[PDB]
C-alpha cells in the first residue's frame, strides 16, 4: 500500500489514489496532487 512509479514517491497509486481513472490521469492524482 505504497507508491507505484512516477508519482509522489510515497503512498499514492492508481491502485488506490484513484482506481477507475489511471487511464485518465496516468496513475496517481486525487491522493497524489500530481495530475
Cβ count near 3 (within 10 Å): 17
Answer whether 22's CB lies under 8 Å from 31's CB: no
Angle at 9 between CA 16 and CA 7, to 5 degrees: 60
How many other CB atoms sit within 10 Å of the CB of residue 18? Answer: 19
Which approach determined this entry? Answer: NMR
Phi/psi-derived region of residue 30, left when phi > 0, alpha when psi is between -120 and 50, beta in every other case? alpha
Amino acid at each position: 500500500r505504497s507508491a507505484i512509479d512516477t508519482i509522489p514517491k510515497s503512498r499514492c497509486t492508481a491502485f488506490q489514489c484513484k482506481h477507475s481513472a489511471k487511464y485518465r490521469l496516468s496513475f496517481c492524482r486525487k491522493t497524489c496532487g500530481t495530475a
